[PDB]
Structures are given as structure tokens and as C-alpha cells.
Design a protein around this ligand. Structure first.
Ligand SMILES: O=c1ccn([C@@H]2O[C@H](COP(=O)(O)OP(=O)(O)O)[C@@H](O)[C@H]2O)c(=O)[nH]1
Ligand SMILES: O=c1ccn([C@@H]2O[C@H](COP(=O)(O)OP(=O)(O)O)[C@@H](O)[C@H]2O)c(=O)[nH]1
Ligand SMILES: OC[C@H]1O[C@@H](O)[C@H](O)[C@@H](O)[C@H]1O
Ligand SMILES: OC[C@H]1O[C@@H](O)[C@H](O)[C@@H](O)[C@H]1O
Ligand SMILES: [Mn+2]
Ligand SMILES: [Mn+2]
Lengths: 271, 271
């Protein structure tokens, strides 16, 4: 038994909860997590979480993993993939049942080469997980981040730009660049710090983005916000099937806690 | 170029536009059809439309097909499947390009055996269409019914019950019946006159419903609203990925034209 949804009473009247191509925009009050959890557990869903911790960024892993254990996909199977140049620096964090961590040793370019890196690993991710979630490491989970986000392809609204008009969006504006988006085009401005989807869709996106960055390199141009520019051009042409609200990528220090955010789920750590 | 969606201005504030399991509820103002049409045309989508016209109900086919040609999936590939006991009575209606009609000659039970009938035809539908849409024939299209409805599995809100509480829903209430739903369970009350989805999901539903009706027959009980009872129990246990609003199944004679319905798309013909 759960509350009956009533078609003439919306739960959120303050925010857009569906995109114009009928992809849910994920806000607190839009979902009944008990239903979603059942649906995903019936498929024995496994969620992969990829995070890069190169050089000094290994310092962010303890809090990132500790808070993931508290809030990320709790109850579901989780496989953390930690890409690092320092395998011995990965903290040994105690994990809940059904949860595992692998350390993958790896060699503008650090942020940029993630797309490349997410796409060798190609067959390993396909056999091991159902979905892949790709996040920044300099973050902490503060509240529930669960199977509501899962879908073939998702992006996340950039917290600086969700109330803005498209002309303000910092898309790549040089036609020279594979990331180019004209001033009168564009749905949203997505942040590169949180995207994902099915393994197939994430491999497609990361391959596409990597292919497009190489083309730009071979043309002597670097998109303005780098991987995030290409991510935005990809998601314009291949629209995500869910969009996460800024509950899922916030910075309380810079932006506070507005009323429209009922929960602050995944937030920046000061650096 | 199209209007930018703005996350802090919802287009519909009056109605629920997403279910609690994050399936869009399809209302005018929720979708940009230009985006959707492009997405579906890139896949060369073919939509099958099944309709039964047995005995006197052949009289409803001319208006049904004529108005489908005006409003149903215009621009997309369409294959009408007309199940009838009178093949010579099917009117010869002129069709738009990319649209074809097949006549399938067939033998409470007429409405009920549709599930059976939709599921022989099994391999024929799989090769011929991407989606199947299953409707009543005693209807007319009055406005756009297009690719916004398409998804793996959909049902449609019954126009008598979209403002009601679940205790009022005329679900099967006898535990004896495969269609049984307890008084404190249930999301919506779906009408049997308009459902569909991918061919795989529709074959699964129709097979399930047929299997459940047989079990009831072998137990001496007939669910209260017959196929619609079983459809409602199926959709409770296997939640649809889109829900159509009552714009998609209405009766102006009985129910008028309320403000909450911006368009009346598919309506009952007086009989
Ligand atoms: O020296 C570095 C710089 C970046 N990163 C990774 O690349 C991500 C994006 O960079 P950063 O968080 O610095 O970008 P910002 O959020 O400030 O724009 C980081 O979270 C890390 O996962 C890293 O591991 N080592
Ligand atoms: O003699 C009949 C009775 C029913 N039907 C089909 O079964 C559907 C459902 O029946 P009906 O429309 O009578 O049900 P209602 O909408 O009144 O409940 C009809 O649209 C027809 O497609 C038919 O073809 N011949
Ligand atoms: O491109 C706009 C920029 O927004 C900043 O607020 C953010 O720190 C950058 O990483 C980039 O996303
Ligand atoms: O079960 C409730 C009933 O609602 C009636 O209004 C409709 O005519 C019936 O076909 C059935 O759907
Ligand atoms: Mn960061
Ligand atoms: Mn009817």
C-alpha cells in the first residue's frame, strides 16, 4: 500500500518535472522510491560507479566512498571503479553487502581523458554492471541517490545555470569545434560531473565524446569547457531519457539551500 | 530552434504529468512534437493499429479509418490491422503514403477474445511493426494522436475515473479471480479501449491477460469488467512506461469539455 497518485493534484507545481521529449526530470516528490526499488531489485540491477582520483585528488576518496556507502544505491548491487595513478593511496573503506570496489591503475587532459578511459574497460563494464554512473571525486553524498536516476541515458542540470536562458549557456560557440552549438539551439546546460546510463549508452557517449575531442585536437582547437562542452553537444543531439535536477549536483557554500531544493544529495567538497 | 524549456516554469501546473514510478503522463503542453517526430523518424518507426469490427461494428470502420488518416501518426509508417467476421464490409478508405491496411478474418467473449486474437498473429506483428496500438472501433479521431504515446508499454486513464479515489475504482474485488486487486492497492483505473507498446510488451500483456481469463473460466468466475479487469491487474503488477491522459479516450456527450482537457483527441461515437 502507498499513497494514490491523483492526476488533478500534482505533487510539484513549482518546477518542470518532464522535458519536452517526455524524459522525467528527477526531483524529490516525483517518485515513490518503494516502487522503484522493487522494480530494480526484480532485475537484480548492478550499478557501476566510476570515479577518477589522479594526483592530489586521492585525498577526496575517503569521504566520497564513506558517504556513497551511506546514500548511493543502498540495497542494490554496487561496483565502484576507482581510476587512480596511486593504487596504494585508495582508502580501505568497509562496504555493505553486495558492494565491491576495484582499483584501476591509470597513467584539462586529466578531466578530458576520462571519456577515453571510461570507453578500454569496454568489455569489462559490459559483463560486470547494468548501468554506469560517472561522477567527480571531489564530492560527498549528503542524501539519497538511488535507482530513480537509472535509465538508458541521463544528464544532470548544472547548478549555475538551471534558471538561465540558453544564450547565457557556456556552450562551445566556435563553429570550428566539434562541440559547437548555435546561440538559438539547446535544451539545458548539463554538468560534466554527473552523467550515466546503461553500459551501452555510456560507452556510446564516451566513445563519441573521445572521437570528437580527437578531431578538435587534430584541428588545433580545445573546446571551452573541454569534456563538458562535448557532453553538452552529445546530449543535444541524443537526448537523455532522464534529467537529474540540481538536487543531484550542488554547492551549498556557493549557492546556499533554496526552497526549490527539498534535498541536497550530492555536493561539492571545498578544495 | 524551439522554445527553451525552463526548469522553474512548468507548462502544466494543474495536472500530474509524471507517475510515481517516473512514467510520463501525456497531456497537451508536456511535449514538443517536433522533437519527438524527429526521434521516431530517425528509427523509421512503424506503428501497428489493431481494431476489431465484428458483427454490427463494421459500421464504425469508415469514420474510424477516415479520421485515423487525418490524425493518427501522420508522417510515420502505419499498418492498420482490421479483425473482422465480414471482410467484404471493410470500407475502402484512401490512405496516405507509407500507410497500409490488412484485413484479418476471424470467427463478453468478443471484447474478451481480443487478447487471444492479438497474441496467433504473434510472429506476423513482430516482423511487420515496431509498436502496437490496440483500440476500440466505435471511436473517432478528433485531434492529433502521435508518437508521444509510444513507449514499451502504455495504458490510458479511464475518463470516468481519473478524478476518483482508488476505493471507487471498479477493479475485480473477488479474491477468486486472477484479476483480483485489494481495496488499498492500485495506481489508476485504465480503460480497455486504448493500450499499447512495443510488439514484445503487447504480446506479453495479451498472453498474460488471455492466460488469466482462461484460469478464471476453468474456475467458473468471469471478472467484473472482463478484459479490462485483467488489463488493470496486469498494469498494476507491470507498470506502464507512459500513461495517456483522458485527452486520449473521451466522450464529449457524457462528459463535456472540461478546461483541464486542452484537446479531445480520440472520442466515442454515439451508438
Ligand atoms: O588533478 C586532477 C584533476 C582532476 N581530477 C578528476 O577530474 C575531475 C574534474 O576535475 P575537477 O573536480 O577539478 O573539476 P571542477 O569540478 O573544479 O570543475 C575531478 O573530480 C577528479 O575526479 C583528478 O582526478 N586529478
Ligand atoms: O459485437 C461486437 C462487440 C464488440 N466489438 C469490439 O469490441 C470492442 C469493445 O466493445 P464496446 O465498444 O461495445 O464496449 P464499450 O466501449 O461499450 O464498453 C468494440 O469497440 C469492438 O471493437 C465488436 O467488434 N463487435
Ligand atoms: O562552464 C560553466 C562553468 O561553471 C562553473 O561554475 C564550473 O565551475 C565550471 O566547472 C564550468 O562547469
Ligand atoms: O468499469 C467501469 C465502466 O465504466 C463505464 O463507464 C464504461 O462504459 C464501462 O465500459 C466500464 O469501463
Ligand atoms: Mn569537481
Ligand atoms: Mn467501445
Amino acid at each position: 500500500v502507498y499513497p494514490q497518485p491523483k492526476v488533478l493534484t500534482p505533487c510539484r507545481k513549482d518546477v518542470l518535472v518532464v522535458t519536452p521529449w517526455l524524459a522525467p526530470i528527477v526531483w524529490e516528490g516525483t517518485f515513490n522510491i518503494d516502487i522503484l526499488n522493487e522494480q530494480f531489485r526484480l532485475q537484480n540491477t548492478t550499478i557501476g560507479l566510476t570515479v577518477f582520483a589522479i594526483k592530489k585528488y586521492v585525498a577526496f576518496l575517503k569521504l566520497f566512498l564513506e558517504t556513497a556507502e551511506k546514500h548511493f544505491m543502498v540495497g542494490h548491487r554496487v561496483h565502484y571503479y576507482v581510476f587512480t595513478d596511486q593504487p596504494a593511496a585508495v582508502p580501505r573503506v568497509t562496504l555493505g553487502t553486495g558492494r565491491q570496489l576495484s582499483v584501476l591503475e591509470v597513467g584539462q587532459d586529466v578531466s578530458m581523458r576520462r571519456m577515453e578511459m571510461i570507453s578500454g574497460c569496454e568489455r569489462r563494464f559490459l559483463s560486470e554492471v547494468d548501468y554506469l554512473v560517472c561522477v567527480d571525486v571531489d564530492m560527498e553524498f549528503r542524501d539519497h541517490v538511488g535507482v530513480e536516476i537509472l535509465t538508458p541515458l541521463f544528464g544532470t542540470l548544472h547548478p549555475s545555470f538551471y534558471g538561465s536562458s540558453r544564450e547565457a549557456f557556456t556552450y562551445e560557440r566556435r563553429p570550428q569545434s566539434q562541440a559547437y552549438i548555435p546561440k538559438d539551439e539547446g535544451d539545458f546546460y548539463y554538468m560534466g560531473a554527473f552523467f550515466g546510463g546503461s553500459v551501452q549508452e555510456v560507452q556510446r557517449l564516451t566513445r563519441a565524446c573521445h572521437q570528437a575531442m580527437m578531431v578538435d585536437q587534430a584541428n588545433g582547437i580545445e573546446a571551452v569547457w573541454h569534456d563538458e562542452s562535448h557532453l553538452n553537444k552529445y546530449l543535444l543531439r541524443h537526448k537523455p531519457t532522464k534529467v537529474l535536477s540540481p538536487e543531484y549536483l550542488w554547492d551549498q557554500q556557493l549557492l546556499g539551500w533554496p526552497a526549490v531544493l527539498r534535498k541536497l544529495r550530492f555536493t561539492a567538497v571545498p578544495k
